[PDB]
Amino acid sequence: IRRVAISTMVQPIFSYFIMITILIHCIFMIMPATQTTYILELVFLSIYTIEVVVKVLARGFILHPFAYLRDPWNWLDFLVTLIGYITLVVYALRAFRVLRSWRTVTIVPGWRTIVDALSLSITSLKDLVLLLLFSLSVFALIGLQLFMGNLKHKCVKHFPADGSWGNFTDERWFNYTSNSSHWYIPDDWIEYPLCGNSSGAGMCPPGYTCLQGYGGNPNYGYTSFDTFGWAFLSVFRLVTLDYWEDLYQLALRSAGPWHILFFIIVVFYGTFCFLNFILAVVVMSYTHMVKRADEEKVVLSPFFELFIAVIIVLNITFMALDHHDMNIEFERILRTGNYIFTSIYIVEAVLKIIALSPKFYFKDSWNVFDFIIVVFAILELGLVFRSFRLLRVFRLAKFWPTLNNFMSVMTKSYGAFVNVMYVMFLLLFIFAIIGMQLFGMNYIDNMERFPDGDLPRWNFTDFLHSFMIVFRALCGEWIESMWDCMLVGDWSCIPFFVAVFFVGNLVILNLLIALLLNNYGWSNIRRVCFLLAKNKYFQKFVTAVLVITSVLLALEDIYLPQRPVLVNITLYVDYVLTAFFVIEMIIMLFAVGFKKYFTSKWYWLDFIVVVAYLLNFVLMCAGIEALQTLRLLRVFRLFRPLSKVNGMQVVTSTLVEAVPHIFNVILVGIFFWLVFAIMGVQLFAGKFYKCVDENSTVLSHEITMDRNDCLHENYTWENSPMNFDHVGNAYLSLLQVATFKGWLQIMNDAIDSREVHKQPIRETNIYMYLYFIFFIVFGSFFILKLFVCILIDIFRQQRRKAEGLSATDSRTQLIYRRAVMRTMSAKPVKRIPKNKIQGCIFDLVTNQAFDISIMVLICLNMVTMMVEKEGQSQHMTEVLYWINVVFIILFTGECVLKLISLRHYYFTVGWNIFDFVVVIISIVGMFLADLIETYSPTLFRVIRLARIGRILRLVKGAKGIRLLLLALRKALRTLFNVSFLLFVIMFVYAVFGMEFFMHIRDAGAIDDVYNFKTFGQSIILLFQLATSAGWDGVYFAIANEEDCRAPDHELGYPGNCGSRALGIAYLVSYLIITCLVVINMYAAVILDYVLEVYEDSKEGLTDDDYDMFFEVW
Amino acid sequence: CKKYDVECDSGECCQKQYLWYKWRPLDCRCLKSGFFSSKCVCRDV
Ligand SMILES: CN(C)[C@H]1CCCC[C@@H]1Nc1ccc(S(=O)(=O)NC(=O)c2cc(Cl)c(OCC3CCCC3)cc2F)c(F)c1
Ligand SMILES: CC(C)CCC[C@@H](C)[C@H]1CC[C@H]2[C@@H]3CC=C4C[C@@H](OC(=O)CCC(=O)O)CC[C@]4(C)[C@H]3CC[C@]12C
Ligand SMILES: *[C@@H]1O[C@H](CO)[C@@H](O)[C@H](O)[C@H]1NC(C)=O
Ligand SMILES: *[C@@H]1O[C@H](CO)[C@@H](O)[C@H](O)[C@H]1NC(C)=O
Ligand SMILES: *[C@@H]1O[C@H](CO)[C@@H](O)[C@H](O)[C@H]1NC(C)=O
């Protein structure tokens, strides 16, 4: 018995039998269930019970140290078997049987490293979880205080004076106002527009008043700051940057532009800091695991090569030149060129095989690749094999050194990459099965709840759609799917989607980033002028002049013509600045001389500005209007003084040393996106046309089968704005896909696509999703995440150089040096208690029980803050005010007792000072709360935020939270410098966009509230765009060139037409500079400091160790 | 000469056609018809 069980258990045949059974079981869960599926589930359950019986008879149950349930693997298997039998005996529970598939992770070699890294990351995220909860709660309370009911603001028609509704009575007015038919809504809109009486907020049309407390909240009532739970969901959504432009715009439209400040904080503190902490934790976990893994342990002449290289480049260019709606000459050229290229390739292969003996020729890998290409070409011209043509592009890898090194690096460490990708796809499969089971029927049962009773494009109806929705959540979009799920489902949708976001986005994708980081990483005059140039006052004066004039330049808005005084100031400043630039250039030329002036880049910038201003001045003298683009070049003088700010040198040094690597990665990405864009052109070129009516609505294929029927019924045969008609369009659409902005429409048109000149049909071509999935793996998860890795490495080196550390020292030596330097500065201190009564108070105060009681009181006060909600009675508000009064009194008693006990020693500790400040603020608040509210509601709400001060004491006493906050405080100066660089870049782009797109007509994201008319609105848009959020709408607005009227110079009309080329340049440059370079800098900084802290607390000494030493001493 | 939506090689296309209620000029264009494959047809400019 026992002998048989042991002998059978450890044979690999049994393990592989069970693994094959599990894989078959997965394949059967993918397919819909029938009677066959029922019998096969019984078969599978029988196999699993045989396994469990064998294992238990082999080992035991729990008693032994090596019993059956001593390993979590057996725990998972046994629990799933119990759940399967429970489902058989007696629905939501039967989904989790899919968890058995987790065992399949062991098939791939090298899985132990990835599994251990994942487990270490999860176990290390505990303290980050505590800090995340606290910070999210604080922000949710602030948002509840700021935006309570603001998202319910609606434009209501005035009570009619004609008397059709009747003689006015208060009841009659309420009855009229409450009717939904009297709320303003543009036709075809699904949500009511928000309004607000604050300056800069959404205005109501004439005859409409902005009221509060009517109707429901946006998005089926799921997007509001009405309660602490909803505020928490909104804060988490904002932190994750998930569709956050919508909430951002709703809040700023209801409350006013100044509330942007709020979003600045949460975005900076929540996105640029914590998610980077999670990334740092994952990086450390993977690095520890990899460290442990490592520790454990004619035709053959260069001219011919160049000829074939140029032929390959020409072939790639011709393949890229293919597009939709060509002329006959062009494609005749292209096909003839393809025939010539195939002929050249055949000649190359034959000449090589003859010159170099056949046995050796096929030995080389590149030769066999060439031969495969030749075979595919001969088959292609023999006879779809024309897809295989794409392989030719990869031939260029032999000749491009950087691309060759990239591919060699990828081939070196394929095992880890395949393990991570397999884990990602296995987790996606598990989540897709679970979602399909939990939410499968609700989408069909409750279709009516959807806006048109029609099934949404993203659902859980079948396995394919479940996988697509889960993959979309893993990409970062989970809030909208959760909205639909809640509409048809229940609360269970929230934990699911949110969970999918943690496991996939914040753990798995961060782990992929960690892999990428680990693997891819006359004498008088000259004398006076030199003296005046080196002088400090002169340099400060020049900087001040530049900054003042640059700031003035931001006042040139759409209202400038209506301010004659501002126009005069602008003109006179232009003339004075021309004179000033000429004088400064002359002074610098006398000071440094021609040679050094014209070999420096900064003096090139100054000279270019001088030339532009002289050109503008000679134009004004000649009577020609000044070119505005040229006079906008003076802002570029702000970069030299900016680089001289304290501590800014590290950031700029990092950026200048990272430019070459970033350029190389951009080239490699252009190559891979060229491959994908050629494929996209060949797949979707000319297939995005569709029939639309007077209203821009697609028609059924039953009524319009194609373009002929479309035009016979006097309809429009309209093309989609984003398409794959040629390579440039494919580039732009793939950029939309990789950034995850505008991708939904592209895939919808892609999967409805049919033959050319045919009406698209909903989901007739579902499997085209595959095309995008691959791209997102190889164009977004890999190429776009190299920038952050490059920045991390270069910033680590730059900070090492900045602090004077030698490049040759190893990490242990650096840690020892840091410990020694810490030991250099340390001093003891002692306090003295009283007099007997004072000494008794002292003994009471010092006791840790007092601190824990205060801890509890702070927690209760925080909860009382959470209890506040919109729509609560005035009685409830008074009761909550009185509870807060009690808490304030208790904390004031704390301060009195501690002051009495510690005399002047109270102020030695910084946290005592924080508590004292908070208590004084709360007392003044008790004095002023009655007065302030009576004498704008916004002022009272904003001043009541100091209430949050006395719950911020909750962080005091924590150890891990203190560790993270110390890491954040060491990095504060660098983070501020990065933010200042970001704001200067935003200022430059704001002025230029004000010049370019100040008159475009309202379209897409651009409207009355959000546009480039003023500097403030431009800054709002640019802050939103710095995260790449919602740039598809901005692009559609600023690149529009249809139904636009040109300017009339004689009549003075400036126009309302956009520029597609200018829009592309502006937006792509902004996305590359901010989203891919400057924003990533944050992460770099964070990681370094966090790592520096963690290795101090793990393999070194920390300030807390010295603190304990001196408390003892 | 031949009509709209018919194979042609740039020298045999009718000047104009009364198709969908307007006299529309015709040029022999060449439209996507697969991977690196296109069918050359007479369509209006
Ligand atoms: C007896 N009677 C004192 C109470 C009942 C009658 C009406 C008045 C009062 N009602 C009450 C309202 C709100 C809060 S509360 O809890 O919402 N607000 C705060 O405690 C709080 C409020 C403010 Cl304005 C504040 O000022 C900011 C400082 C910053 C610099 C100088 C001003 C500070 C505060 F702590 C509160 F407890 C009490
Ligand atoms: C140094 C770095 C780290 C921080 C930079 C400070 C920003 C938070 C400042 C700089 C410019 C400021 C903006 C300047 C102009 C405006 C317009 C202002 O609204 C108005 O113009 C009110 C008048 C109206 O709307 O009618 C709203 C605040 C806002 C967006 C400001 C919000 C705060 C901003 C972004
Ligand atoms: C709103 O007004 C319309 C117009 O008379 C009326 O038919 C409708 O009943 C009103 N709504 C309610 C809830 O009474
Ligand atoms: C657009 O919609 C309106 C109302 O929904 C309807 O008359 C028609 O579908 C379109 N308008 C016109 C004038 O045809
Ligand atoms: C276009 O549709 C009309 C309407 O039925 C039909 O008479 C005509 O033959 C069609 N032409 C083509 C080329 O399909």
Author numbering:
A (entry chain A): 129 to 218, 224 to 430, 515 to 600, 608 to 745, 842 to 1154, 1157 to 1257, 1260 to 1437
B (entry chain B): 13 to 57
Mind quoting what the paper says about this structure?
NaV channels contain 24-transmembrane segments linked in four homologous domains (DI-DIV), where four peripheral voltage-sensor domains (VSD1-4) surround a central ion-conducting pore module that houses the ion selectivity filter and key ligand and toxin binding sites. The NaV1.7 channel is expressed predominantly in the peripheral nervous system, and genetic studies have identified compelling loss-of-function and gain-of-function phenotypes in human pain syndromes, prompting significant efforts to develop NaV1.7-selective inhibitors as potential novel analgesic drugs. Thus, we sought to exploit an engineered human VSD4-NaV1.7-NaVPas cockroach channel chimeric construct that had been previously shown to complex with small molecule inhibitors and peptide toxins known to target VSD4.
Seeking to leverage existing knowledge of the arylsulfonamide binding pocket, GNE-9296 (compound 2) was synthesized in an attempt to directly graft on a significant portion of the GNE-3565 scaffold. Gratifyingly, this molecule retained substantial potency, affording channel blockade at an IC50 of 47 nM (n = 8). A cryo-EM structure of GNE-9296 bound to the VSD4 NaV1.7-NaVPas channel confirmed that the molecule adopts the desired hybrid binding mode. Notably, in this hybrid configuration, Y1537 adopts a similar arrangement as observed for the arylsulfonamides. Further analysis of the cryo-EM structure of GNE-9296 revealed that the aryl ring in the S2/S3 binding pocket was shifted ~1 Å away from the VSD4 core compared to arylsulfonamides such as GNE-3565 (data not shown). (G) FSC between two half datasets yields a global resolution estimate of approximately 3.1 Å resolution from the refinement using an overall mask of the VSD4-NaV1.7-NaVPas channel bound to GNE-9296 (compound 2). In addition to offering valuable information for retrospective analysis of historical NaV1.7 VSD4 domain inhibitors, the structure of GDC-0310 inspired the development of a class of structurally differentiated inhibitors that trap a novel conformation of VSD4. These hybrid molecules bridge both the S2/S3 and S3/S4 helical gaps, with the anionic moiety situated centrally, interacting with the arginine gating charge network within the core of the domain.
